[PDB]
């Protein structure tokens, strides 16, 4: 019973990226190679994140929602569409070399 508690402002994304980049110093090559060999999946990637945030409103779902709209997803879609068009005997353009 109280007025709505405003969620705290998060951070400036520019400085967040700056700090994230600065974290690259604390990286060991051999251990990073081991971590790269380990196949991170929907479970392993997010299991140890955010400690034990109560709500955890499907952090995987949030990542997927913001990821399928990323430039990488669009590039994959464009590649698949181009391959389908080529397979469909698309009328090749005048300057499509």
């Amino acid at each position: 019973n109280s007025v709505t508690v405003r969620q705290d402002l998060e951070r400036q994304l520019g400085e967040l990226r700056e700090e994230f980049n600065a974290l690259s110093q604390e990286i060991a090559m051999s251990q990073l190679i081991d971590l790269a060999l380990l196949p991170l999946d929907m479970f392993s990637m997010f299991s140890g994140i955010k400690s034990t945030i109560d709500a955890a409103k499907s952090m995987a779902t949030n990542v997927m929602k913001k990821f399928k709209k990323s430039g990488l997803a669009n590039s994959v879609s464009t590649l698949t569409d181009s391959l389908s068009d080529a397979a469909s005997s698309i009328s090749r353009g005048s300057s499509i070399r």
């Binding site: 969620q7 402002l9 994304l13 520019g14």
Partner: protein, 262 residues
């Protein structure tokens, strides 16, 4: 594209100047042909007749409403008043720099500032800007998004405002749109076309909202004065130096506007 030169090789009348001055200067001069006299003196210095255009503004605040600089080289004689340091700094920041501005529709959308180079420039007869920061869930912080009386006031009946709010937080604005227009402007760099001559007190123009820097560019000049005739004789006699301080615009292109060119 790349421009390759050489560090050993020895490499061995078509422009317009605009002088912007306050009304009181002409009022004190009190000679109906003073502009013609200055034209002839500029001619002696090497400026063909008609190459110099004289523009009269009434006040710094009034001139600050959409400054219209339409010469190849512009010199603004700005008088100093100790109660107008921020106004002079805002006008200098507006004209001495180049801004890429886009329209802002405060009554519909919320807005934020992307980075240190982006600000909100408001101009008009009377700009009374109030702001309310918002959080991720679109609730005001220290203000109620619906009651504009609680908003935080950053301007008051200003002819020109260059407002800078915390970056990366949405804001709701209550700028009086009837007598003011506010635009989202990103500073590109320096406008070499225009130089400012502060005819008055100390050097106080802070053309960088950054508190750690108050750079004094070569185009920000200052002169002590007691007679406008002496001020104008100084400008005419040292026109060569002022032009050497200035440079031609490098801006590729922007909205079309009137210019006074040859």
């Amino acid at each position: 594209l790349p421009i390759t030169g050489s560090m050993d090789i020895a490499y061995a009348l078509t422009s317009t100047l605009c002088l912007y001055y306050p009304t009181e200067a002409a009022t004190e001069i009190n000679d109906n042909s003073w502009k013609d006299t200055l034209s002839q003196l500029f001619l002696t210095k090497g400026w063909p007749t008609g190459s110099v255009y004289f523009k009269e503004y009434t006040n710094i605040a009034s001139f600050s409403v959409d400054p219209q600089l339409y010469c190849d080289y512009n010199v603004v004689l700005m008088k100093y008043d100790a109660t107008l340091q921020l106004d002079m700094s805002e006008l200098a920041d507006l004209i001495l720099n180049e801004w890429l501005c886009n329209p802002m529709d405060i009554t519909l959308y919320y807005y934020q500032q992307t980075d240190e180079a982006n600000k909100w420039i408001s101009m008009g007869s009377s700009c009374t800007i109030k702001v309310c920061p918002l959080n991720t869930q679109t609730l005001g912080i220290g203000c109620l998004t619906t009651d504009a009386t609680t908003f935080e006031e950053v301007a008051t009946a200003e002819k020109l405002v260059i407002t800078d709010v915390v970056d990366g937080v949405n804001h709701k604005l209550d700028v009086t749109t009837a007598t003011c227009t506010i635009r989202n402007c990103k500073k590109l760099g320096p406008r070499e076309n225009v130089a400012v001559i502060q005819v008055g007190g100390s050097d106080i123009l802070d053309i960088t909202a950054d508190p750690t820097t108050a750079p004094q560019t070569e185009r920000m000049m200052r002169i002590n004065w007691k007679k406008w005739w002496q001020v104008f004789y100084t400008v005419v006699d040292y026109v060569d130096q002022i032009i050497q301080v200035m440079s031609k615009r490098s801006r590729s292109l922007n909205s079309a506007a009137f210019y006074y060119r040859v």
